[PDB]
Structures are given as C-alpha cells and as structure tokens.
Ligand binder design. Structure first.
Ligand SMILES: C[S@@+](CC[C@H](N)C(=O)[O-])C[C@H]1O[C@@H](n2cnc3c(N)ncnc32)[C@H](O)[C@@H]1O
Ligand SMILES: C[S@@+](CC[C@H](N)C(=O)[O-])C[C@H]1O[C@@H](n2cnc3c(N)ncnc32)[C@H](O)[C@@H]1O
Ligand SMILES: Cn1cc2c(n1)c(=O)n(-c1cccnc1C1CC1)c1cc(Cl)c(F)cc21
Ligand SMILES: Cn1cc2c(n1)c(=O)n(-c1cccnc1C1CC1)c1cc(Cl)c(F)cc21
Ligand SMILES: [Cl-]
Ligand SMILES: [Cl-]
Ligand SMILES: [Cl-]
Ligand SMILES: [Cl-]
Ligand SMILES: [Cl-]
Ligand SMILES: [Cl-]
Ligand SMILES: [Cl-]
Ligand SMILES: [Cl-]
Ligand SMILES: [Cl-]
Ligand SMILES: [Cl-]
Ligand code: NA
Ligand code: NA
Lengths: 380, 380
C-alpha cells in the first residue's frame, strides 16, 4: 500500500522565480495607483538583463527601472561577485497597451460582475488534509528548505550562500480510503549557489545540520534517507547567468508540487481578469472549503472558461473516495455556495489589492491566510 | 457516474507555440551538425521581435537569423497585414555557452550511459485506452481542431484565417472500473485570428460547418452541445502583437490536456540531457507500454532525478484501479524492463535525431509513431 511521491521547490533567486517576482512587482506597482489596471507582464532574465514584455493598460505612472531593480535588490543580487547586480544590470522594456480587440471582448462597457473571462482555459484547485494548511507534505517541505536557505543567507549564518537554490523532497506515503498519510522522507535534494571559497564538505555538512534538520521533523528522517546535497559538485555560477529565466516556468512549484492537476496557465504578472490566476485561486478556495468543512479529506476541482464569457463552461469535482457524498452532490454544494465569475471572484478574494509579489515565491497556496486560504462556511 | 472534463489546444501561430517551435528549430539546427550539442534555448516573442536567450555549447555553425525566420515563414506570418512578418521582424540573440559548472557536474568526462541528469526535477507519463493512440479524447479533439484551421488556411478554403488560434473541448464521460468512456461533447470553444473584412456570422458558420463537423464525429454532437465560436467578437490583432509569447508556457497542451499529472518542466529548446524532456518522453513510453501490453487500461508514472545523478531518485505507478496487478507489481515490471538513465533513454528513443520541431505543435504525444509512441514488449 505504500508509494513514493516527489515534489520540488526553488528559491527567490532561481532565475524563473526572479521573473515571477518582478512580474508581480510590476503588477503591484500598477494596482497601487490604478486598481483596474490591465496587466500581462512577462519577464525574461539572462546574464545582465531583465526584459519586460507584454501588455499593460493602466492609469498608473510606473518607474519600471526602479520597480525592477528594487525587486532584484530584495532577492539579494547586489554585486557582480554573485553573478547579478540590481545596480548595474540592463533593464529593457517592450510593453504595449492591451490589444483593443481583447479589451472590447472582455471588459469594455461591461458591468464588473459580468466581465468576461480574460481568456479561455482550464484551472484546477486541490486540497489535502495531510497537513493543517491542506497542502501536500512534499511541496511544503521543499518550500521550507528554500526559505531556510534564504533565512541563513540573510542572517549571515552561512555567508557563502547565494540566492539561487532548488530543493526536492520524496516522501513515502501510505493510503487510507483515498486519503494519503506521510510515513517518512525517502530522499532530499538541495542545490544552492555558493561562493568560490567554501568547500563541498563544509557545504554538505551545513545543509544537513543547519538546513534539513532545522526544517524536517526527525521522525521523518532515518538511516535509510538518501541525501543529494550539492550533487553537481560545484554551483558558483548561478542566477540568470547560469540559466535563463522566464515568467510562468515554475507553475507546478507555484501550486501543488505535482499533486492534484494543472491547467497550464501561469499566475505572475496578471490582473484578476486573467482567469489563469483568479479562477485557480478560487478553485483552491473551493477545494480548501470542502476539506475544512469536513465534506472531503482530499479533493480536486476543475473549472474552465471561454474568453468573453463570465460563467465557467464546466465545473468538475473528484474526491478520491474521501467523501460519503457523491461527486455530483459535492458539485451541487459548490454551485450553491460559490459564484466563479471573475467579476465576483475579484470581490470575494479582494484581487485588486497589491499583494501579488508576496505570492511569487514559496508557492501561492498554503500560507499567510490569503483570502483563498480562508475557508467559506458552506450551506447545504 | 458521469462527469465533465475540459482540455485546450493552440495553433502553430499562437505566440507561445511560435516560441516552442523556434526553440526546437534551433535545437534541430544544432543537432544536424553536432549530435552532442548542449542546448537550452528559450524564445520570447512580442510585436516585431523574436529574442533567443539561453545556453548552447555546440560545434555547429548555426545561422540564427535564417533558422528563426524560416520557422516563422512556415507558421505563416509573412506580411505586416497579419501582424508579423518573418522577412522584416527583429531577431535578437542573447545566447551564451552552457555554464561550465553545470557541464562538469552533468556530462564532462562521463561515460554516455552514466551521464548525470541535466537537472533535478519530476516528470510524469500517462496513457489511457479511451483512444487508439492512448490519449484523452478531449486533448486529441482540441489539437485536431487547430490542425484543421491550419489546413483550411493553407489550402485557401478559408483565406480570412490567420495562424493564431485556440480551441477547447469539454467532454462528458462515464467511468468503468477506473477507465473513462467518452459519451458526448458538451462544449466547444474556437478562437482564431482573422482578417479585417470577414464578418462574425460568416466565421461562426464556417467554424461549425467546415471545422467542427470535419473533425468531431457527429455521434458526439447533439442539440445540447454548446458552441462558443469567436466568443470575443473580434480577433484581428493576433500573434505576438496581441500577446507576448514565451517558450514552455503551453506545457499542458504539450502533454495530456490536464489529465494525468505534470512535473512542471518544458520540453522545447532542450537536448536529451535535460530530463524535463527525455524522462517525460520515457515516462510516456512506459505508460503506453503498460496499456498496450494489456496490464492497465489507464496509468500514471512518476519519475524524479537529481542533477548529476544518472538513475532516477524515485519511480511511482498509479493504475486507477484498472489492473489486476498491484501498483507494486507494475513497478517491478517497469524496473525489470526499462532503464531510465538519460544516457540510456537517448539510445532507446534516438534522442539525438533532429525531429524536435515536429513535436512542438499539436502535442508531443499520441501521434506520428515517434519512438516513445512505439510500445516496448514487456517481459514478466
Ligand atoms: C540546471 S539549470 C538548467 C539547465 C541549463 N539551462 C543548461 O544550460 O544546462 C536549472 C537550474 O538549476 C540550478 N543550477 C544552475 N547551475 C547549477 C549547478 N552548477 N549545479 C546545480 N544546480 C544548478 C539553477 O537553479 C538553474 O536555474
Ligand atoms: C487572450 S490573450 C492573453 C491575455 C492578454 N495577454 C491580455 O493582454 O489581456 C491569450 C491568447 O488568446 C488569443 N487571443 C488574442 N487576442 C484575442 C482576441 N481578440 N480574441 C480571442 N482570443 C484572442 C491568442 O491566442 C493569445 O495568445
Ligand atoms: C473516472 N475519473 C473521473 C476523473 C478522473 N477519472 C480523473 O482522472 N480526473 C483527474 C484528472 C487529472 C488529475 N487527477 C484526476 C483525478 C484523480 C483522478 C478527474 C479530475 C476531475 Cl477534476 C474530475 F472532476 C473527475 C476526474
Ligand atoms: C493514494 N494515492 C496514491 C497516489 C495518489 N493517491 C495520487 O493522488 N497520485 C496522483 C498525483 C497527481 C495526479 N494524479 C494522481 C493519481 C490519480 C490519483 C499518485 C500519483 C502517482 Cl504517479 C502514484 F504513483 C501514486 C499516486
Ligand atoms: Cl529550472
Ligand atoms: Cl496574459
Ligand atoms: Cl485603467
Ligand atoms: Cl500539519
Ligand atoms: Cl495548527
Ligand atoms: Cl495563452
Ligand atoms: Cl534548460
Ligand atoms: Cl559539442
Ligand atoms: Cl480511437
Ligand atoms: Cl486503429
Ligand atoms: Na496567457
Ligand atoms: Na530549466
């Protein structure tokens, strides 16, 4: 009855994640001045370069140089010795207005509640009772390992650390009538950018003693746990210099770590009219509401949209055998309790508020009591 | 027992898909001269611009201007009236060598069979007996609708069509002991870029009569089927001008349309040492081999890797209740029949051959009898 499952996470200075954070810094900067900004901001990062590309229609006056460089500063790339420096990098901007054809089909002259979806697409929400925050343990631990690295970098404990990191956690699980129960950690991977001087033994010792042991409960670690710490042997070159980054290339890190399902859409750089983000947040909210409401132990929700149409085209529920209600009954409960038009989701989840940069590392779900993490009390 | 499920696909001129095709045109150009090229080529597209960014170490001499422009030509963007022109667009190149630190940790001085994974990560394979090609009907139909649009554009039947398109198909399914059985098509969305002159009624009529009816069997369509054809009302601006594109932003279109699972990695622009591609292809091959071998009706396979390590860190099987063998027994069969080291996958699936551009539209799976689509005969 046991099985393995693996999830990964990345750090704030991973080049794809840099792009997500910059895209959302740009979104937040617009929303701070114009709550109704239409934003579709892609970021690309390579050696010495941040490029913004996409479509923004907004009444805001945004200093892109400042916004980008402050985001990079926060991440920690502040010197050529680290491979990237917010003070001296190139920031290039290829931003246009939103297509008039999209605007007229989605939101022009439409009542806010009746705004069309900003695109077609499909989105999923997932929740699992295996952790109190209703997330898979694999992905929670992977995120926390990256957060620990950033903490020990910033507090000067491990000053050889640089911002670019990746982690991966394999858990051995058992099953209990469709719910999943973590037993032990089977394998951990950590790769993190480092300075020229520190040796591989010093790093591996610190990663086990100061990172893994500070994050993963000892009850999950045993003599058989496999550790792959700095498995490449050398990671001095990192950030965008080591690997080009793009917005929306960590969509599984951003969500459920391979559990559940994904419809393909990226979150960062997009305002609420882009259902790739708003409907995925709403679907998480639905899933978490069903689990915290005691209807399910685990649940997957699909929704889908057509551009220009407000109501979803389909809604589907899968409960993994963890409810005494049928999936049809759960669907009826969802339909009675939630309105998944984007122009209603925006009100319920307060999606004009400029909090998006906070979402763009360490996963969008399972932390900080964002509105989509606060369950709805269900009537049925 | 019935449920809905939705998948989408996009056309060759969708701006994200343009990027995937260009990335793989670049990969193929390298492989044609240097089978061992190390390629990590990201493409970004916006009005008037193709940018290549990433890392290539290769003995090839590649004319990026020519490769990019020929790919755009093939797609059909050949005039400013269409919003993009291969003859006159900007092609910018920000390509460096592969990081020496990665190279030394992955492949330098290593026997080919024992090459390390080019990164950490997780990957899934999926197969379902609901179609002969072992793919979900939702995603197959969505792809075929885009292919039909391109066919009728290219043959001059519907000369108002432009290359940028999206489709979405919702199927109503029943379940049979874990297998899924399509009943009917519930909803179809088609959005396609068009010329200034054609009206909405002409387009909607053609999309139903010449596209949908030419693709979707009549047995699946009924009086209740919902059609959202050109739902935005106007789609003259399109391609990169309408929406910035990036490589690796259609990873669910590229795979199983939301079915199965995804580990997050993009395929296009990457040589075989990048397990995001090679191990996903191998996992598809495993899944399809289990279904075509009569062991399962449906199956999901997870694998995972650490950078620099050749053997997978974990392998997992889920059969949805569609095998008389346990998941543990299936895992043993997989382990006895497959070697999922990247340096062995490359031999089994012939992954130095320059066929990658063909994979980069209409999905990587379920068509053309690529090596990962030819089942392995299993011993057990
Ligand atoms: C391995 S790189 C992807 C492959 C790369 N584009 C290439 O040219 O081979 C993906 C991520 O791994 C991490 N990485 C970069 N250099 C690394 C190294 N030397 N050792 C381990 N991980 C590294 C960074 O987080 C980077 O964004
Ligand atoms: C709707 S756009 C994404 C949102 C866009 N970035 C914005 O600024 O609102 C996503 C895709 O939809 C398609 N699209 C572009 N313009 C469209 C229109 N006027 N009507 C319908 N679909 C359109 C293209 O395939 C495009 O790549
Ligand atoms: C018989 N049956 C019904 C469904 C299903 N098979 C199935 O595979 N998925 C699905 C797709 C992707 C990932 N995970 C799952 C489910 C965990 C199996 C469904 C998803 C949804 Cl949202 C739904 F409502 C039904 C099924
Ligand atoms: C009790 N149990 C075992 C597994 C599981 N729950 C589960 O949710 N997934 C999973 C993850 C993502 C999408 N779809 C699925 C499966 C259709 C449920 C698994 C995947 C794999 Cl590859 C595996 F080997 C086991 C489970
Ligand atoms: Cl990566
Ligand atoms: Cl967008
Ligand atoms: Cl505005
Ligand atoms: Cl917990
Ligand atoms: Cl608690
Ligand atoms: Cl899109
Ligand atoms: Cl890569
Ligand atoms: Cl070479
Ligand atoms: Cl078939
Ligand atoms: Cl046949
Ligand atoms: Na998009
Ligand atoms: Na990558």
């Amino acid at each position: 009855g046991t099985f393995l499952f693996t999830s990964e996470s990345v750090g704030e200075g991973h080049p794809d994640k840099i792009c997500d954070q910059i895209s959302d810094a740009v979104l937040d900067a617009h929303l701070q001045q114009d709550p109704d900004a239409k934003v579709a901001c892609e970021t690309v990062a390579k050696t010495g370069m941040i490029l913004l590309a996409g479509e923004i229609t907004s009444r805001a006056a945004v200093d892109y140089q400042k916004v980008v460089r402050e985001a990079v500063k926060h991440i920690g790339y502040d010197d050529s010795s680290k491979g990237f420096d917010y003070k001296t990098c190139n920031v290039l901007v290829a931003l246009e207005q939103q297509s008039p054809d999209i605007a007229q089909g989605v939101h022009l002259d439409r009542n806010e509640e009746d705004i069309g979806a900003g695109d077609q697409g499909l989105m999923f929400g997932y929740a699992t009772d295996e952790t109190e925050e209703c997330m898979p343990l694999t992905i929670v631990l992977a995120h926390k390992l990256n957060a620990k690295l950033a903490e020990l970098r910033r507090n000067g404990t491990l000053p050889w650390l640089r911002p670019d990191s990746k982690t991966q956690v394999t858990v051995q699980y058992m099953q209990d009538r469709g719910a999943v129960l973590p037993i032990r950690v089977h394998t951990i991977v950590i790769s993190v950018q480092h300075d020229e001087e520190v040796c591989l033994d010093e790093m591996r010792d610190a990663l086990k003693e100061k990172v893994i042991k500070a994050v993963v409960p000892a009850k999950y670690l045993d003599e058989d746990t496999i550790y792959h710490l700095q498995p490449s042997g050398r990671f001095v070159i990192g950030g965008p210099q080591g690997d080009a980054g793009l917005t929306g290339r960590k969509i599984i890190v951003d969500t459920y770590g391979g559990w559940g399902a994904h419809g393909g859409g990226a979150f960062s750089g997009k305002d609420y009219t882009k259902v790739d983000r708003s409907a995925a947040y709403a679907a998480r909210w639905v899933a978490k509401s069903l689990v915290k409401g005691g209807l399910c132990r685990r649940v997957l929700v699909q929704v889908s949209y057509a551009i220009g149409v407000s109501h979803p085209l389909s809604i589907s529920i899968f409960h993994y055998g963890t409810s005494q209600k049928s999936e049809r009954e759960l669907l009826e409960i969802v339909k009675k309790n939630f309105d998944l038009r984007p122009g209603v989701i925006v009100r319920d989840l307060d999606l004009k508020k400029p909090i998006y940069q906070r979402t763009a590392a360490y996963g969008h779900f399972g932390r900080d009591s964002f509105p989509w993490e606060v369950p709805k009390k269900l009537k049925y």
